[PDB]
């Protein structure tokens, strides 16, 4: 792990890093939120912002120092603060941002700044290639409603890494966390769909725990089984 300001960065692969930011909440302590940084050729792709604009600006600052390649785009995985809280920092830097069309629709209602572009998805959950221009190794998949209705997931092609966001919890998790906006009926099936969408992926990255094995997916699905 590397510390940069109030943020932590961990290299997961030759071209993949995890960024970690924290938000303090009275009576619940500091909560970590993870996103991904991917170097693809002569450019950098980012998955999810940090909690805030200032923290997200630091991600860009870290990228400039450690990778020194222009950030081509960013993808945010749903309309909550830990994923889209720092959209302004991205837009201020002239970075093209992408989100589920539903996330952008929900964003103002959630007090979030919408992404500049909208992703749409086929009936099998895979992103419409026309909506995800120049995404490189990023394979975006909508597993169905779970943590939220708009939640999406990202696989990193050429690696053993898949990003489940807040949909997937680690194998040692006791709860599915914030179920405030959750679809308790479909959550389990959505978790399993994610696993099936990236079957060879052996490293599962998620929002609120260190990278885990595929057991995180199964364990999450089985916790969600008890919500039906
Ligand atoms: C405040 C929102 O951004 C919230 C959300 O996206 O629903 C964040 C924080 C909680 S963390 C709840 C328990 N996890 C503790 N590490 C959470 C989650 O459980 O996935 N996501
Ligand atoms: Zn969330
Ligand atoms: Zn979260």
Outline the structure in words.
This is beta-lactamase. Its EC number is 3.5.2.6. Its main location: periplasm. Belongs to the metallo-beta-lactamase superfamily. Class-B beta-lactamase family. Residues 32-208 form the Metallo-beta-lactamase domain. Strand 11 (161-165), helix 5 and strand 12 (203-206) form a beta-alpha-beta unit. The termini are far apart. The chain has a single domain (1-228), classed as Ribonuclease Z/Hydroxyacylglutathione hydrolase-like (Metallo-beta-lactamase, Chain A, 4-Layer Sandwich), CATH 3.60.15. Strands 1-2-3-4-5-6-7-8 form an eight-stranded mixed β-sheet. It has a four-stranded mixed β-sheet with strand order 9-10-11-12, with no helix packed on it. Helix 5 runs antiparallel to helix 6. It has six helices and twelve strands. The protein is globular and about 45 Å long. The chain is of the alpha/beta class and 228 residues long. One zinc ion is lined by residues 78, 80, 147-148, 166, 178.
